[PDB]
Symmetry: D2
């Protein structure tokens, strides 16, 4: 045949390229020389296509893939067409059950490398030499929605990493907030059922804004700490690259001398912390529901690889009871002001998968998968997690051999006496299938614990008590961490939290649930309670106004590490800018703009009111990437408007909406020359206003002004003015 175009423009270049410049593609067609041990190891299973014949799964060549075998050309389909029945049979069985929680997620390959040897504190082999590189596969996700729900919802986010080490698979299964909603694993099914779609009508999708979620929260004050996080702007990340990651529980690091050290795991983003604002996140679930999945893929195809540093909070065993909270209570954080995070290695994500289903959907992560050098604790939530991850996977991936699915296979050796099970791949030649045996001289054999390459042994903790079903009294305090989190937010972050609580509480149909939640907020902080109650048209009683606030945490009244914006770290590399074109761009402006952009690693998208192209004033042909309505302001970080024939787009409803939307959402805006005339549509004062960059032309002082606001993420001083702007 040869249905492909002459010019070969149906295929993308195998080189780093900017978002939207080319069609995206399977990772190994796009970046064939990006290798790692896990990625080379998958070459036994990759399948090509070009130059091969079309066949059945048995290897038989198909002559006509357009028709069914029939008795006469207008006749009945014949049962003997095995070719049709095979093709329809595979199609009929394509789906497998989605994950019970965290079903919506996006993944990529990469590697980890430590900064130094950690042999003094752990015997884990992957942390033992700064030159030992460890292949990894990371999946980012939401919690509540199904596989087809939208990415920029308000929810907690999952951050799971599989380490393919030389001593076994180690999975670090975390979240993007430092604590969880509940204390004991026995309440997980109650909590998940409350936040998920209600059982009679299966509404709502991807949202906690409903009666059952808020009923459960108001009757279980242990959940309030994680609720403050979710209601904050932490709940709507701008990207998986710009959010923090946490293991949440306290684990143990075990060294070669046998000493145990308590640890909490942390992931710190090299691109900085950044979130959207609620109206923008919400509208983005309709304009581009695949926003986070798309921007991670394209970031990797552009070479803006997501980078994170691994960090440890370390507390010696003798200090277990130094804080006024329990170290095993997963609803309690460890303030970095009390115990700093030691930066210990870095992770880079530099390759997209080849097939979403084979690699992302079939991947299995489990927190119980640790390696010698690590160990658990008695945290009641982690303790119950150990049961569930293997159990769930028997039904989701079809049997006990899920470790033989290529993405899950260890890279190191695995030999034991386990046999059979659905879809067994490995063919054992061992004459023995039990131990002790003499017929194979007892191989494979057990290995004693040791400093390196030894068998797993659990840390010999002392256990003392009765068999009981009871919560520890030290876990009984629910308001001081939420209060330290409130006081560590800047003022605009505190306003975002209040609007988060108000918007969700307004969707609760039973008014008595609204009031009970509000009563709980009064125990954290009065200002906060008063604010949410003003929006719900509820009045605080006498009793509620005299409630004594909770105590501070170990003398602390605030910790700037809990805010997203208190201490700036925003980086502009990998951000995107929309450039509104008119039918005769002043080439002088464009060029100044594109070259300032490219020096800071900022991408640009050229938008017009139609597709195809437009020509500048000097005859340069500018191709259009998208239209104004097709790539809304929601999808970009800042908006620039060059000079030229402004008359061309000055009366265009969408081009004006573009500016009002981006202005409402606190994004930097730049207008040169007669583009300044757009100030009338967003009603800006005459002298000027911070956040609006303007000049006679696109000069270098003009771009430094634009790039400087962009490093600060959003224009926080504008909040006050956006109340009276209709968009």
């Amino acid at each position: 045949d040869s249905l492909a175009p002459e010019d070969g423009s149906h295929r993308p270049a195998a080189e780093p390229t900017p978002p939207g410049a080319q069609p995206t593609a399977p990772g190994s067609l796009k970046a064939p020389d990006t290798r790692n041990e896990k990625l080379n190891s998958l070459e036994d299973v990759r399948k090509g296509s070009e130059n091969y014949a079309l066949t059945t799964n048995q290897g038989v060549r198909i002559a006509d893939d357009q028709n069914s075998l029939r008795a006469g050309s207008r006749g009945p389909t014949l049962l003997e067409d095995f070719i049709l029945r095979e093709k329809i049979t595979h199609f009929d069985h394509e789906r497998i059950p989605e994950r019970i929680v965290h079903a919506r997620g996006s993944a990529a390959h990469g590697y980890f490398q430590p900064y130094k040897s950690l042999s003094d504190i752990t015997k884990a082999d992957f942390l033992s030499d700064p030159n030992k590189i460890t292949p990894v596969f990371v999946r980012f996700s939401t919690v509540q929605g199904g596989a087809g729900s939208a990415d920029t919802v308000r929810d907690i986010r999952g951050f799971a990493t599989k380490f393919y080490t030389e001593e076994g698979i180690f999975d670090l299964v975390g979240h993007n907030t430092p604590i969880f909603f509940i204390q004991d694993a026995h309440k997980f099914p109650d909590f998940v059922h409350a936040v998920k779609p209600e059982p009679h009508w299966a509404i709502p999708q991807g949202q906690s804004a409903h009666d059952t979620f808020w009923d459960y929260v108001s009757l279980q004050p242990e959940t309030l700490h994680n609720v403050m996080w979710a209601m904050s702007d932490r709940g709507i990340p701008r990207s998986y690259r710009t959010m923090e990651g946490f293991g949440i529980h306290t684990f143990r690091l075990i060294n070669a001398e046998g000493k145990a050290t308590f640890v909490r795991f942390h992931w710190k983003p090299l691109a900085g912390k950044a979130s959207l604002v609620w109206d923008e996140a919400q509208k983005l679930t309709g304009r581009d529901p695949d926003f986070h999945r798309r921007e991670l893929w394209e970031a990797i195809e552009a070479g803006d690889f997501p980078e994170y540093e691994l960090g440890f909070q370390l507390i010696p065993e003798e200090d277990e009871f130094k804080f006024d909270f329990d170290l095993l209570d997963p609803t309690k954080l460890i303030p970095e002001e009390l115990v700093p995070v030691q930066r210990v290695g870095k992770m880079v994500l530099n390759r997209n998968p080849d097939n979403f289903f084979a690699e992302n959907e079939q991947a299995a992560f489990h927190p119980g998968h640790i390696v010698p050098g690590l160990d658990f604790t008695n945290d009641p939530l982690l303790q119950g997690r150990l049961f569930s991850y293997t159990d769930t996977q028997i039904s989701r991936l079809g049997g006990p051999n899920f470790h033989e699915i290529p993405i899950n296979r260890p890279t190191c050796p695995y030999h034991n006496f386990q046999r059979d099970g659905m879809h067994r791949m490995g063919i054992d030649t061992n004459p023995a299938n039990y131990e002790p045996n003499s017929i194979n001289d007892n191989w494979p054999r057990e290995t004693p614990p040791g400093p390196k390459r030894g068998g797993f042994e659990s840390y010999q903790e002392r256990v003392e008590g009765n068999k009981v079903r009871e919560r520890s009294p030290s876990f009984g305090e629910y308001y001081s961490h939420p209060r330290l989190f409130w006081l560590s937010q800047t003022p605009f972050e505190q306003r975002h939290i209040v609007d988060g609580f108000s918007f969700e509480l307004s969707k609760v149909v039973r008014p008595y649930i609204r009031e009970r939640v509000v009563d709980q907020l009064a125990h954290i902080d009065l200002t906060l309670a008063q604010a949410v109650a003003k929006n719900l048209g509820i009045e605080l009683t006498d009793d509620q106004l005299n409630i004594t606030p909770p105590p501070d945490v170990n003398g602390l009244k605030k910790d700037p590490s809990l805010s997203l914006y208190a201490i700036p770290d925003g980086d502009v590399k990998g951000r995107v800018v929309a450039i509104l074109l008119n039918d005769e761009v002043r080439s002088a402006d464009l060029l100044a703009i594109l070259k300032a952009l490219k020096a800071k690693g900022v991408h640009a998208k050229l938008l017009y009111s139609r597709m195809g192209e437009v020509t500048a004033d000097d005859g340069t042909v500018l191709p259009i990437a998208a239209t104004f309505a097709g790539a809304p302001s929601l999808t970009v970080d800042a908006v620039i408007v060059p000079c030229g024939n402004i008359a061309d787009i000055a009366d265009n409803g969408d081009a004006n909406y573009y500016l009002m939307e981006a202005y409402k959402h606190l994004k930097p805006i730049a207008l040169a020359g007669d583009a300044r005339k757009f100030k009338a549509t967003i009603k800006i004062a005459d002298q000027g206003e911070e956040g609006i960059v303007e000049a006679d032309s696109a000069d270098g002082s003009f771009m430094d002004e634009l790039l400087t606001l962009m490093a600060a993420h959003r224009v926080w001083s504008r909040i006050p003015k956006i109340d009276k702007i209709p968009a």
Copy 2:
């Protein structure tokens, strides 16, 4: 631990060795140099064990595989023990459903090779050149019983061969008789349910001798032909090596010029045809329920490779309507007297599997798996089979990617647009997942039909008729094939047929069923029915005595290729002999005996009343293989008793009973010198008789008379004496 004996006798030599000499083992350790393209391609999934550490499935080394993790050495088991839970979880999910029919089966690897080119009549690549070697995987089985049922029951046998060809998998799924019980696939669940264990109490296992089977037969006369084969000695073969193989249905062979020829497939045993006699077979299901599986395996380990010749019965399309019966009716055979079998090539089975579960239990055969060069026909039993094998494999093997389990994968290339499904192994890199596509330039591509490597195209047969649920009038004759079969048996085979019917019908509880069956037998042949009637105490009515017999089949009144023994084809190689020792065997007898046997390729089993060793008269030390009770006469083909201290065993009940049981089952018996005292135990005249070899010492003709009788398989002239003899 290092538990093997130093002397290394825990492991068998990697060379051909006689049955029982050494412990049996996985194929790649017993015969590491027996190779083929299929065996070689499985090397990617094989796993060793020697010199490796014992690990979890994630690769973590295990320090203690004897204990669970508890709180205190007498404490409760902890939930955090992920090593225990993984181990027990895999164990708990080992089983998969067994095959709905043919659950019990034994398999092996081999190769096929054509004798000459068949390009004149078919364009199937595997039959086109005498130097093309095609690797095969074969499974032999019973029908009714579960996977743990016994081997030597009375039943049809399956014979399935998977040909790993260069243009796709070809599965020839046959049976050991040339016809099946029913005409249309629509009745398969009805026929299968009648023969299987009755639904209230799930009895009986591996047997057709119960009420529902005979009820179904007496109401459906189409079953009579195959019922005659199952009640004959064809139903209890001596070994999978000594039975015939048949495709049953008429298929089509299509050449390069597009011409179609009708074909019936045949497998001819090169070791000839042999069967057991009923009381031996039934007893053998208790003393060794795995006798066929064991014999198959041991024959390959010793080098007696099962060899079969593939043969074709060829009928030109113009002869479709030339016979008394319909070619598309599977209850009718094509007599070799009318249409000779053309011997076309040979299959040799030379290596056992490594792991039964992985290669045997998971293999999937299907008659719909054909290649260009072949095609189907309108046989209604074959038509409904095409639907069933793909459907059943979806739940047995867990999903539509059953072709990715290692034993089922083709060795030739396979590429298509099918994606996902449970247990997906292949990672596709094709950017497109549909056709026609321009994004991958339409690859993979359809391929036109041609003489070699072309696409599959169905033979364009003419269909004309209305949509009807009706049986063809030409399918309506049920008695002449059964009669043709009956008249071709030898007289002693007719007697075994009578006894099979009498025995089976004696187990039918409702007497009216026995009477209707007998009636049906009177339509086939009067002598047959009078004989069955007298064993059940029934009298034929005067009307039954005058039923007119059915016609000849195209003028034939007998066809000798339908008998097992009319035209003898015995081969003594691979048969086995029992030698009963005493504490002082005449070593001159023993050396003449063992050297004659080795010269013909016959194995010996040295038996005694205890295990260990015996010292011969010249001081030679003999290792004992098994006791008289441990390896009964049911397991050997003939008995030799040598001279020596005969008083050691003259009074042992087991040694005597050993000669009475073999004598009863018509096997040859040889007595040297004073071992002749044993003649009184079996009531043999002084004069002697055919079947009893006797001499002063074990020398010259002694062994040659013995081996002549062994080539004749059983001593049919003794039938008359066995009715007395309490054995």
Copy 3:
């Protein structure tokens, strides 16, 4: 067509009859009047048959159940025959995985009744009153063999009882000897793999007489006690009725005041103890592989009901 004989000899009398005198049948047609509370609650799903039309599972009457739909009498089968595909689809999916261990077993319904109140030692409701009856469901089995293996092999026997009590289901899942082969659950897969058919060829069925089992026994002396029991005549009972039953583990009984008492459970057969001899038992796996199953069904049909203390 194809109907019953005029004399009605196709059907069994619904009264106690001796083994072999009549055809065996489903319990509810054999003993309509035998009831307990579990048997009565199963009435919702029992399905009859006399006087009804043959249908698909969607309830459409079938006109012709002897043939496939085809283009002409000698033509090809059509894809649109949904009656044909429903029938063959259900058949193709009849089987489910057999039990990992104890795949071969035979079951029956009955009831349990206490002799006296046991509330001084336990607050278990089913044991608190002599006049309170508990419906039971019991399953006897072998250990090693598959579901189609033989009954009278040398092996341990399982004795599992489901009690449908008023405060929940209680399962007392035991064996016919008072100890097991091993001490820790961590070694279960190792012991079961050694006793089951060897992995390269899947031999032998329902027998411990092979190399891997004795290998394991010789290296793990903890197994010797139950190996003694298995090699005795306890390994080959005459019937499920003539064997003892045990819970093996020490369990605990808790009364109303919170006091605990250790307990081991026993079942005592009122027909007494009796076993076969080996030669008999081995040969009986060939002459009738279904002897213990047959014997249990037939004893209940004859009125020789299995009873245990």
Copy 4:
């Protein structure tokens, strides 16, 4: 069979016919109905061949396909009328 787990999906409460359904089909994952019929095949004399086939008729009869006329060769081809 895979979405709903086996061949007894018609026993799932929402899918059940409200009219009677009797046949010789048995077993399969999650079988709810407990069949008392002594036969599980037809024809049978042990249950006097019940449940039985019903001939076609104006009402309450068995299903029979309309006897459309079929003519032509076995082809994998699109009709020219569809083009």
